[PDB]
């Protein structure tokens, strides 16, 4: 395990506009507390699914707890990394183009993925680095497919600040416009709670709502497992 | 009534692709069994965020029973109809832009709605058309309250196939690859059950699956408001 | 002609969110200088092409010259008008839902357009209204198809403030990123000039550039007829 | 060289729709005449915002001369290849994701580019393949300056059809309906001339037509950098 060991000495050849800029491993980690999470590759489903958004979303919190930088590492080059960083809207994390797989290799995390045509790429994992020394490491289990149950941002947060209480998961079925929907949305914002809004537009239809909740209309809200109800039930509880 | 009578001969000016395409009345109805339901207008409070949806939802069933096409008719033009069809996203039904009110008029269903600023529009009604001949017609009553007490898709289905008993609502959260999801989904296939699918790639993410099912993985299956579980769980239910 | 005549007395049934709001003809025009332009209908090509954008773009200027409000009138209802107003991004103009064609009829501008399936709609025209009295009117000629050579915002501006000198038309071929392209773009902004950027992305390819300019690359800039050149030619002139 | 030799047997893992699709080497080359050109990588400065474009531009011509398919090969995966294909928008060419460098390696064209952080990538080259057998190959020289002095589409065309003389560049501004535009366009059709089209509906507006041609209406036709005019004008030119 790399825990307790010094992060590999790597110099990344990056691009910032039309100019090349070498970002060194020391520059990134020395005298700093950094969170890192590697992905198999740029422009993909489970990686852009939540692994990435979720980290950008909790970045302000990690900062509040001492984390200086939160990096995303992928065995891709800058051109591709940038083009992806631009597609994703994540202004809270730095993209590291480990295109030669050097850093990933040094982390003993380089794996072959020829069955997808990705050549050698990084295995999914996250870690906390204090002054270049790997403190904690969350290596996704060796299971087939695309495992994601340990490198997530939450697991990291609970590890970094277990005191911070785990906020309940919040999903909300809403119809565009729909008066009382906005009455639950902003009520959440006002309550300062994050949530996933499944819109009856392109995400789901009315079936799901009726199949999941039973009720025949929106807005439907479920908070961490338990079923809430209408904008008027949200209020109550 | 128009029951037993031939549907009006109308040529609709529509917009297919970035070009104009004339869709004739004969083309739509000749030698075909069609379901039709008119609406006062596009984007107006559909008055039932379920009316148009429910038809699109039961379309597969109507097809199973002989209906060739299910059309939505509104006294609007194609530009507006298309922009709306792109909203409602109801892939199972054709949108007919009776923008001159010609077809609606011929059906003796043209009514004035100047009190809403809609000019002349269609009155709410549905009908079954066999080879151009209006077979059945469900003309909405002039009663306050639910605007669709008779032209709804259900009333139509019960009429066309009273034998039929709609399956309970089925929703399943899935992900790409996930063979478990496939095992769960095949099970449904091999059960004559329909099922909406919320893909973790786009339709949603992990947050939603945790929130709704209180579980940490997919597939998560819901049937009729009750939570069932995953591939494994379904099989127990279907035993 | 309606010039010198009082605008029709109409009350429009509009929608603002989930509530109905009557907007009266007097409310709009009384004691006010208003610019108006009617369209055959909402959600269409030549109407959303430039007729509408161009008016929203020059609105600040019309205001600077005394125009209080700039209205878009179409024989459509509010639901459709709003849904369109939301699609178009024009925060400088008011949308008037003349769904009964009443106002349009009063303006003697109601025409039949059954050949498109639009039923009765408005004929394209713009006008300047001072305290409810039509001052000037630019009625598009009676030609087949969809005529647009008189109701435009420019014709209006030149009429309202002929002193204001006509700014030259500016189109620019650019490649995404393309260093020197941004060197012409913002140079224009800095120069305070409006322009149409044809991007080699989805608008055009390299052929057009080579067919129009001749030069083999971007950024290509043409200002009112005459061919400019490279970001470095723009500078010179 | 690989000239006269059979192309490597490779199965490419690609992404068609939201599903995986194996595209085999045989499927691409067997019983077909194919043009291929490899690139160091996707999104990298294509080094010639014309290289990839020019192939897509001359594709119709290559088809006219027997070429069935024109492929772009890069040591990238489909996710990246697709996201790039969606950028470049080159409808006339197939994108091959040689993400394991397998095909490139087999062509003895795999080179290291660690100095850019690209790991192993393909070296610039194009080739003509007849029924799996490499017929001709244009391997780029190790000279500074223009990165494509031999693998370009033109060099290929002149080789495949030296008889051919590419038509001058033709661009025309048009609008929907505008019969004049159609008259101008038909004229080109009836002339074996290709022409890009900037539609006033999307590709652009009136501003651009004024700016570029100093005219107030469409159609405005440009041929080889010279301004020609409209339907009327073209006819004079084609007399």
Distance separating alpha carbons of residues A149 and A155, to the nearest angstrom = 8
Closest among A40, A18, A16, A77 to D118, alpha carbons compared: A77
Interface test with B, best of A52, A169, A197 (most B CBs within 10 A): A169
Domain boundary among D162, D193, D210: D162
Joined tokens for residue A119:
């050549």
Phi-psi region of D183 (alpha: psi -120 to 50; beta: other; left: phi over 0): alpha
Distance separating alpha carbons of residues B168 and D137, to the nearest angstrom = 62
Tell me, yes or no, if B201 comes closer than 8 A to chain D by beta carbon.
yes
D82: nearest CA partner in chain A:
A43
C19: nearest CA partner in chain B:
B45
Domain boundary among A114, A130, A162: A162
Map residue C153 onto helix, strand or coil: helix
Apex CA A198: angle with CA A181 and CA B195, to 5°?
125
Interface test with B, best of A52, A150, A210 (most B CBs within 10 A): A210
Q: What are phi and psi of C6, to 5 degrees?
A: -80, 135
Whether A95 contacts A85, CB under 8 Å? yes
Joined tokens for residue D94:
């197939």
D202: nearest CA partner in chain B:
B18
Interface test with C, best of D46, D173, D196, D215 (most C CBs within 10 A): D196
Q: What is the CATH number of the domain that holds C80?
A: 3.40.30.10
C82: nearest CA partner in chain A:
A177
Helical axes B51-64 vs B78-88, angle rounded to 10°: 80
Distance separating alpha carbons of residues D69 and D63, to the nearest angstrom = 8
Whether C209 contacts C219, CB under 8 Å? no
- Chains touching chain D through at least 3 C-beta pairs below 8 angstroms are A, B, C
Residues A18 and A80 in one domain: yes
Residues C235 and C145 in one domain: no
Tell me, yes or no, if D165 comes closer than 8 A to chain C by beta carbon.
no
Task: Name C192's Cβ contacts closer than 8 Å, sequence gap at least 6.
Answer: none
Whether D44 contacts A77, CB under 8 Å? yes
Whether C151 contacts C140, CB under 8 Å? yes
Question: Smallest CA–CA separation between C65 and chain D, in Å?
Answer: 23
**H helix runs in D153-219, sequence order:** 153-160, 179-189, 206-213
Which residues in D lie closer than 8 A to residue B199 (C-beta atoms)? 18
- The verdict on a CB contact (< 8 Å) between B77 and C118 is yes
Tell me, yes or no, if A43 comes closer than 8 A to chain D by beta carbon.
yes
Whether A146 contacts D127, CB under 8 Å? no
* Residue among D82, D99, D115 whose CB faces A119 most closely: D99
Phi-psi region of D69 (alpha: psi -120 to 50; beta: other; left: phi over 0): beta
Which residues in A lie closer than 8 A to residue C177 (C-beta atoms)? 18
* Residue among B49, B210, B225 whose CB faces A214 most closely: B225
Task: Name C186's Cβ contacts closer than 8 Å, sequence gap at least 6.
Answer: none
Helical axes B78-88 vs C78-87, angle rounded to 10°: 70
Distance separating alpha carbons of residues B156 and B66, to the nearest angstrom = 13
- The verdict on a CB contact (< 8 Å) between A116 and D45 is no
In the set A7, A35, A47, A67, the catalytic residue is A47
E strand segments, A98-223: 110-112, 120-122, 125-130, 133-139, 170-174, 196-199, 220-223
Q: Please report the number of interchain residue pairs, chain B to chain C, with beta-carbon separation below 8 angstroms.
A: 77
Which residues in C lie closer than 8 A to residue A18 (C-beta atoms)? 177, 179
Task: Determine which helix (DSSP H) or strand (DSSP E) holds B182, and give its type and residue range.
Answer: helix B179-189
Can you give the resolution of this entry in Å?
2.8
The neighbouring-strand residues paired with D73 are: D38, D96
Joined tokens for residue B26:
């004969």
Q: What are phi and psi of A187, to 5 degrees?
A: -65, -35
D201: nearest CA partner in chain B:
B18
- The verdict on a CB contact (< 8 Å) between A99 and D117 is yes
Residues B142 and B181 in one domain: no
* Residue among D45, D77, D117 whose CB faces A116 most closely: D77
Which residues in B lie closer than 8 A to residue D82 (C-beta atoms)? none
* Residue among D57, D198, D211 whose CB faces C225 most closely: D211
Map residue C174 onto helix, strand or coil: strand
Residues D228 and D150 in one domain: no
Map residue C210 onto helix, strand or coil: helix
Q: How many domains does chain B have?
A: 2
Q: What are phi and psi of A211, to 5 degrees?
A: -80, -35
Q: Please report the number of interchain residue pairs, chain C to chain D, with beta-carbon separation below 8 angstroms.
A: 115
Residues D10 and D53 in one domain: yes
| Catalytic sites of C, residue numbers | 47
Tell me, yes or no, if A75 comes closer than 8 A to chain D by beta carbon.
yes
What number of helices (H) and strands (E) belong to chain B?
Answer: 8, 13
Residues D33 and D144 in one domain: yes
The span from the first CA to the last CA of chain B, in angstroms, equals 50
Residues D71 and D94 in one domain: yes
Residues A77 and A190 in one domain: no
Helical axes D78-88 vs A78-87, angle rounded to 10°: 70
D 96-125 near A (Cβ less than 8 A): 97-102, 114-120
Task: Name A88's Cβ contacts closer than 8 Å, sequence gap at least 6.
Answer: A48, A52, A53, A56
| Catalytic sites of B, residue numbers | 47
Residues C114 and C211 in one domain: no
Residues D65 and D156 in one domain: yes
- The verdict on a CB contact (< 8 Å) between C118 and B99 is yes
Whether B161 contacts B68, CB under 8 Å? no
Distance separating alpha carbons of residues C197 and D208, to the nearest angstrom = 8
- The verdict on a CB contact (< 8 Å) between C208 and D169 is yes
Q: Tell me the residue range of the domain where B98 lies.
A: 4-162
- The verdict on a CB contact (< 8 Å) between A41 and D79 is yes
Tell me, yes or no, if D225 comes closer than 8 A to chain C by beta carbon.
yes
The sign of the CA dihedral C174, C176, C178, C180 is positive
Distance separating alpha carbons of residues A10 and B138, to the nearest angstrom = 74
D177: nearest CA partner in chain B:
B19
- The verdict on a CB contact (< 8 Å) between B201 and D176 is no
> Could you tell me the strand order of the sheet in which A170-174 lies?
A196-199, A170-174, A220-223, A226-229
Which contacts of B57-64 are long-range, i.e. CB under 8 A and separated by 24 or more positions?
A: B57/A205, B57/A206, B57/A207, B57/B92, B57/B153, B58/B153, B58/B154, B58/B157, B58/B166, B59/B92, B59/B93, B60/B92, B60/B194, B61/B157, B61/B161, B61/B164, B61/B166, B62/B35, B62/B156, B62/B157, B62/B160
Local structure of residue B6 (DSSP, 8 states): B
| Residue with token string 């785990």 | A166
Method by which this entry was solved: X-ray
Whether A220 contacts B225, CB under 8 Å? no
Tell me, yes or no, if D176 comes closer than 8 A to chain B by beta carbon.
yes
Distance separating alpha carbons of residues B51 and B152, to the nearest angstrom = 6
Residues B48 and B144 in one domain: yes
Domain boundary among C162, C182, C200: C162
**CA dihedral of C39, C41, C44, C47, whole degrees rounded to 10:** 10
Closest among D129, D2, D138, D133 to D68, alpha carbons compared: D129
Which residues in B lie closer than 8 A to residue C13 (C-beta atoms)? 115-117
The sign of the CA dihedral C110, C115, C118, C119 is positive
Residues B158 and B197 in one domain: no
């Amino acid at each position: 395990s790399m825990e307790g060991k010094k992060v590999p000495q790597v110099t990344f050849r990056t691009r910032q506009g039309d100019k090349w800029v070498d970002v060194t491993t020391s520059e990134l980690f020395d005298n700093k507390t950094v969170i890192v999470f590697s992905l198999p590759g740029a422009f993909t489903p489970t990686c852009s699914s939540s692994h990435l958004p979720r980290y950008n979303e909790l970045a302000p919190v990690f900062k509040k707890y001492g984390v200086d930088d939160i990096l995303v590492v992928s065995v891709n080059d800058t051109f591709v990394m940038n083009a992806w960083k631009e597609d994703e809207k994540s202004e809270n994390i730095s993209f590291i183009p480990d295109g030669n797989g050097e850093f990933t290799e040094g982390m003993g995390m380089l794996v072959g993925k020829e069955d997808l045509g990705f050549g050698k790429r990084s295995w999914r994992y996250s870690m906390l680095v204090k002054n270049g020394v790997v403190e904690k490491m969350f290596i996704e289990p060796n299971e087939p497919g695309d495992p994601f149950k340990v490198s997530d941002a939450d697991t990291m947060l609970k590890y970094l600040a277990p005191q911070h209480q785990v906020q309940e998961s919040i999903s909300i079925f809403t119809k565009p416009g729909c008066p009382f929907c906005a009455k639950a949305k902003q009520l959440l914002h006002d309550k300062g709670l994050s949530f996933e809004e499944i819109i009856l537009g392109h995400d789901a239809t009315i079936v799901s709502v009726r199949a999941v909740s039973g009720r025949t209309t929106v807005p439907q809200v479920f908070i961490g497992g338990k079923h809430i109800g209408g904008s008027d039930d949200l209020e109550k509880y």
